[PDB]
RNA sequence: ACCAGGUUGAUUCUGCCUGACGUGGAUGCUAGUCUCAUAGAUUUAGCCAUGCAUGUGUAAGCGAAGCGAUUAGUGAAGCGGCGGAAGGCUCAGUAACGGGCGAGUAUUUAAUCUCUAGAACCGGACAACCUCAGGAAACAGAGGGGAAAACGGAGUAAGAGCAUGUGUUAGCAUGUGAUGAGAACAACAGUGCAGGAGAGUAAGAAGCCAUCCCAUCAGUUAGUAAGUAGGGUAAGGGCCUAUUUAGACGUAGACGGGUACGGGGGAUUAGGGUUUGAUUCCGGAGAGGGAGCCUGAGAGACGGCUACCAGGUCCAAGGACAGCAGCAGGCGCGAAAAUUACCGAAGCCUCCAAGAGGGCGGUAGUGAAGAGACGUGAAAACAAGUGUGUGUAAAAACCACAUGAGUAACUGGAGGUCAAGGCUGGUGCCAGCAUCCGCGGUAAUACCAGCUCCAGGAGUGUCUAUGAUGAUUGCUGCGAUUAAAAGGUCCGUAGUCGAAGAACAGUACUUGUUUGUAAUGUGGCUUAUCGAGAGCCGAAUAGAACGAGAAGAGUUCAGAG
RNA sequence: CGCUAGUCAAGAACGAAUCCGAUGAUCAAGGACGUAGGCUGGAGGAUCGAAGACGAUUAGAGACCGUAGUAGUUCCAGCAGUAAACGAUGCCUACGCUGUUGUGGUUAUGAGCACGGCAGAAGAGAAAUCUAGUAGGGCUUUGGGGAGAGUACGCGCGCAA
RNA sequence: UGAGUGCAGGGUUCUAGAUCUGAUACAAGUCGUAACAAGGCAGCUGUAGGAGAACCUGUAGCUGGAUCA
């Protein structure tokens, strides 16, 4: 039927590829995902910035090239992604900075995920333990807690996370 | 269909208005009137949206029924009844007074005035006939008509009104050198004034503009109307006096020119 | 009379044109009588309608060029 | 019923013909290819049954489910 | 009833269409109005938009104006004489316009009378008026105005007709 | 922007079958929580029990009976006024004024706006009231009063058309004239109604351009094509009729037949494409099938009338009534689709209204059609429960605090394609399995079971249409010596295609400016714990108006051949 | 299309300082020719020989072989419209390596132009091989896994086949 | 202006039918052996006779022939 909402997810071609089973396994062992859709929906986000890119470095119009350009690299900073020494107000630089965007990784947004920033900071023992802390209530941000465990946290915001005790 | 329509669908209404569209299926059918029902909007969204004074229907109505509301000097007891485009609002309990004007964007905005602009509006000459007993007669773009005004106006000047005695008091031409304002097209909102004017036979005049922070922007006489005697306005105008930026432009001001 | 007025289709799929015609049924008042005949030029304003197919009255025409009728030189050069 | 034909089906599973009577009520399928084309081993036979008054034929062979009675 | 709409008509290839709607009132004809020579009566008819018309089924009288001296007057009318359209209209003395008809020409006689240069202006019109003859042409739309009203043929106007009447 | 298995004793090719992946319906087995959408379209535009979906009164049109009164009052039966032509439902018919873009006439328009704008007398009835009183019912009679801003007449303003001057063209002058009216009331301090001229809204008719398959359908048409004159209409017109002229349309597909609600849009997609559109917006048509119609500003109306045909219902047998492609609901038909639920609240529409009405619309209930976010433990310490408050029209859910606690996985597979066992027991070309290739004749990693593994996971298998696979439909981009494939040879019309040199012109061609897109989609930003969602911004297709450039295309010339 | 003379029209190629100036390429519909065998009428009839009849051979031969024998095989006036009608390679127009051998004209005797054969090479192609090399030049015919099937129904031509 | 209904015809789509005649599948039935080797008369295309049946015979053609001589 067709209605209203978005379908964030691509099934891959081959079901049963070898070289694609063991490396998505791997990153889902590693990083404690609950299972195959978590990963997909992180990797069509990533393609969407690629293809941003790409269409602005061949773009004939000057106009939209400065205008867009800055939008995206801004955007991207905010989240904590894209971590480098951007300068607006230099056509060279711009270009220098979306092609390093070309070559970004799935691994870069995992690691903005709320339940391995609580992990990475050392508020729990394991990659698991943080999952079951931000169920259960015990993880608050800005004095108030946060129940999804695919909160993305923006850069900066590290200051402000905090966990309290069981409620026994 | 057998007959007059009477409903309006809610995406059907003039993006003028400026109405959400998911809050339900209808919108207010304006009633006949004084200007064009795409060149004009409802008082009820006014009290409800544009100026916030009511916030519910039973509101609405006893605000009318107590007669508060004044439109070009008649108290009004319509509730779908037409305001247009330089069109005087009032209440003469508090006396408040607001023009009715145009956002960058095009869509509707109210501007609060002093007791000398509530005096006077604009309208654009569109017709001059001789009438039974010889009488002498001219009609204006929102349904005006004038009886023994000067016999020099010509059709296409633009002609401000007395509000209180119902009779013309100056008149201006379409020539180089004058202020416009802008009533439909890309650059509704836009004001700025006359670079030059092309002359077409049978067809639309088209008129270039240069803007007051450099700009040039040409459109036909058909959306224009002129408004000041020569160099200056009449009517004052809106908290930004009329510049429209691009996007580009709003990233230029606002991180800093592109440097070699 | 009937006036053809000809022009070009684009059909986008082959990226190519097909010629088009269309035939007009045009009032010939007795003014131009004389001076209208097949193949030449006609200019034609639009009007209310005059019959179940006629809405075209001739205003005017351009009649078929001959740019000279050649010159002959003299024998005697 | 739909067309007042008669049509030869095939019947799946092991015991499956034990699951039907005479008179019985059956829902009918097709067996996959393009156009309707006979499948493996069986000539020119062109469905199969489904289901038997009302019940799916895997539940009743298995044993999982019993005949309406 | 009557209709004006082409639905039933065939295009201009000569094939036939087919038909896509009932028959509606906007597109309503009626039957004709025949208005003859006798006492007056006249009908009024509610027509769109809450508008009368007004339908003369009898008519004895006209209005005549003369179109050189600048008068108009009231008479009676005897009988048609010639219709352009069909012959039939004529037999049977059928009102409508453009049909040519016989009035008392004695009030006319007597105000063309005054001038004297009228019998050199118009010998035709003067011998035919000493004869009792009187024609006259008429121009409103007695179905649809209610009433006959028209003008004195002259000069080459009865030069024409004339030789439209004769045997 | 991608491949794999299958003709042989092996090999290299042509070629088709099958797998792997989106989406629309149907269905098996299994199912913890919360949020946003959507549901008798496909078959029968089949048939329908019941209840509801359209009515409205003020200080201010007329006011009967009753009640009551020092000649007051009341409180209203009917009449009048305004609406019932919108909205809701469906896709039968239509290859067409059905669809897109421009333009504003040859037209009519209750309400509403601006300017302007009204000295008028007389008479009956109809309904209700009162007295009889019919009929099985549905529905009606006699007789007698009496009102209006209801109705008909009188005068009187006004006044269509026709003719001539003068200003196209209003207007004015003059002659002639059919027709022929008109509302006030209340003071809580206002509300109405007659005439004109211009607007505003809505139709009717028109201009241009685009529109499906069959040649085993090649000729079609005679109101047909046109002219003159008249009738008719709100209005142009063969719209209709009389006499004259023979036209009009076709291989660049006429005419006939079959099929179809048309767009904005949807699905797939590197690009070029291929398929669909009953279905939130716009426009069209219908109300069992056909046809006629009164009233009105507006209907060829069906929750109006009239007749036939097909079907029904009640009767006292004489007659009466009725039409769910409105909302619930029932029966059929099918492989196929929810409650005879609440609603002085939100968005709007209707009236004579500081109020009344609305199944239009909103709120929940029901169902693994679709789409988000999360449970089913951690190493010290875990959903779903419950109670208060909130929330709403009233609710439930949601959220806040406080109490208990310790519950929570299945579907398809394991020989190759294709991820994962030559494990143990039965069966012996049987019973079965297998999209394809192939297994089983007593030593079956393929059947039937046990046990371990694999894949996706609140979900997974199957059937059926379609897009991709597919350069197996080829514009980009395939083939024709031998695999399927160049007419036995010429002539020839329609059709498609056509020198050098010197000049010329602007309709195609390309481009500027201005128009042309609500939703959807596209580029963004901001607020619901997050994410779909919601709100605001910017640009945009095809199509049209006016300019510009002249290479290619086009037209002409001859001290060129 | 193969004996010799005489006669009657038109065509191809070659040589060269002739004339006209875009008159042209390809082609649904429509028209003309088309070995052999067959058919309608006339002439004729040597040789050969379908059908038919015998003799042998064989299990059986109706066939192959031998004897015999008719329609046809020839000519004139027509109908018909098919072939492994094949170099199984459409028609115009291009760009393209060498050696050798022909046929007809012309020649500074060095060579050319038209129509051919042959042998290598380089490219090409699944190979065999090359009318198949290079290529978005123009126009027509035509194929889309085997079978059923070039069959059924309708239609057009023909005396029939 | 016309609903309905008489009587003849057409145009479409389905369906019945004694009997005849195609095709396809027939584990392996009966009679021969026509093709693939010079397949025991080299094969094949057109046309015309004949015949239980494959097929045989005359006439013109082709090599995809058993010969590039």
């Known amino acids: 039927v067709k209605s209203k909402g978005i379908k964030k997810i691509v099934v891959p071609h081959r079901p049963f590829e070898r070289e694609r089973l063991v490396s998505e396994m791997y990153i889902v062992g590693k990083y404690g995902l ?4 978590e990963l997909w929906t992180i990797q069509k986000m990533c393609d969407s910035f690629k293809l941003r890119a790409k269409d602005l470095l061949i773009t004939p119009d000057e106009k939209e090239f400065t205008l867009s350009s800055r939008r995206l690299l801004k955007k991207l900073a905010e989240w904590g992604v894209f971590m480098e020494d951007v300068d607006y107000n230099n056509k060279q630089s711009l270009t220098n900075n979306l092609e390093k965007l070309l070559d970004l990784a799935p691994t870069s947004f995992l690691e903005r995920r709320l339940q391995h920033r609580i992990f990475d900071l050392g508020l729990a023992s394991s ?8 169920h259960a209530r015990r993880v608050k941000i800005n004095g108030s807690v946060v129940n999804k465990p695919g909160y993305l946290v923006k850069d900066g915001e590290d200051g402000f996370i905090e966990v309290v005790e069981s409620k026994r | 269909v057998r007959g007059p329509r009477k409903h309006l669908k809610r995406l059907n209404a003039p993006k003028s208005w400026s109405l959400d569209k998911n809050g339900g299926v209808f919108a207010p059918r304006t009633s006949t009137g004084p200007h064009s029902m795409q060149e004009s909007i409802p008082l009820c969204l006014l009290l409800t949206r544009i100026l916030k004074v009511a916030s519910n229907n039973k509101e609405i109505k006893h605000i009318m029924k107590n007669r508060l509301i004044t439109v070009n000097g008649n108290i009004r007891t319509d509730s779908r009844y037409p305001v247009g485009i330089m069109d005087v609002l009032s209440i003469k309990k508090t006396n408040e007074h607001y023009r009715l004007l145009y956002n960058i964007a095009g869509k509707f905005v109210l501007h609060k005035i002093t007791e000398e ?25 929102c349904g005006g008509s004038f009886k023994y005004a000067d016999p020099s106006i010509s059709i296409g000047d633009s002609v401000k009104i007395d509000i209180k005695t119902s009779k013309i008091v100056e008149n201006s031409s379409l020539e180089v050198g004058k202020v416009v304002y802008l009533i439909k097209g890309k650059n509704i909102g836009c004001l ?3 670079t030059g004017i092309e002359k077409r036979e049978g067809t639309h005049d088209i008129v270039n503009i240069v803007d007051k922070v450099g700009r040039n922007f040409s459109t036909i006489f058909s959306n224009i109307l002129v408004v000041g005697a020569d160099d200056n306005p009449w009517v004052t105008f809106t908290k930004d006096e009329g510049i429209k930026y691009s996007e580009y432009e709003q990233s230029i001001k606002e991180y800093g020119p592109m440097n070699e | 009379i009937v006036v053809v007025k000809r022009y070009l289709h684009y059909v986008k799929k082959y990226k190519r044109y097909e010629r088009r015609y269309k035939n007009v049924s045009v009032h010939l008042s007795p003014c131009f009588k004389g001076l209208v005949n097949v193949g030449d030029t006609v200019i034609c304003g639009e009007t209310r309608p005059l019959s179940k197919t006629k809405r075209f009255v001739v205003v005017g025409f351009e009649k078929k060029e001959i740019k000279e ?7 005697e050069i | 019923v739909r067309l007042n034909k008669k049509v030869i089906a095939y019947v799946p599973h092991d015991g499956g013909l034990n699951q039907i009577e005479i008179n019985d009520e059956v829902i009918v399928e097709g067996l996959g290819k393009k156009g309707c084309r006979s499948k493996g081993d069986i000539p020119g036979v062109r469905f199969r049954v489904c289901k038997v008054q009302k019940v799916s034929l895997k539940a009743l062979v298995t044993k999982k489910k019993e005949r309406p009675a | 009833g009557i209709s004006r709409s082409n639905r039933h008509k065939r295009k201009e290839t000569g094939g036939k269409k087919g038909l896509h709607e009932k028959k509606r009132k906007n597109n309503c004809g009626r039957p004709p109005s025949n208005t003859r020579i006798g006492e007056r009566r006249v009908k009024q008819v509610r027509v769109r938009g809450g508008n009368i018309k007004h339908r003369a089924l009898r008519l004895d009288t006209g209005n005549i104006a003369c179109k050189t001296h600048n008068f108009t007057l009231n008479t009676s009318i005897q009988n048609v004489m010639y219709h352009p359209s069909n012959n039939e209209f004529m037999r049977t003395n059928i009102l409508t316009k453009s049909a040519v008809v016989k009035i008392n020409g004695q009030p006319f006689k007597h105000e063309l009378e005054k001038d004297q240069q009228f019998e050199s202006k118009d010998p035709v019109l003067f011998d035919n008026l000493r004869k009792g003859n009187c024609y006259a042409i008429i121009t409103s739309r007695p179905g649809q105005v209610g009433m006959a009203d028209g003008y004195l043929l002259q000069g080459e106007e009865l030069k024409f007709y004339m030789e439209k009447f004769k045997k």
Request: proline share 2%; hydrophobic share 35%.
């Open chain 1, 127 to 134: 990659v698991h333990q943080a999952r079951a802390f931000i």
């Open chain 1, 34 to 37: 609950r299972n195959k859709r």
């Open chain 3, 69 to 75: 009728k050649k010159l002959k030189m003299l024998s």
């Open chain 2, 192 to 194: 700025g004034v006359i």
């Open chain 2, 117 to 141: 602009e509530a005096q006077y509006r604009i309208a654009k000459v569109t017709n001059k006939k001789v009438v039974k007993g010889n009488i002498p007669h001219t009609y204006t773009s």
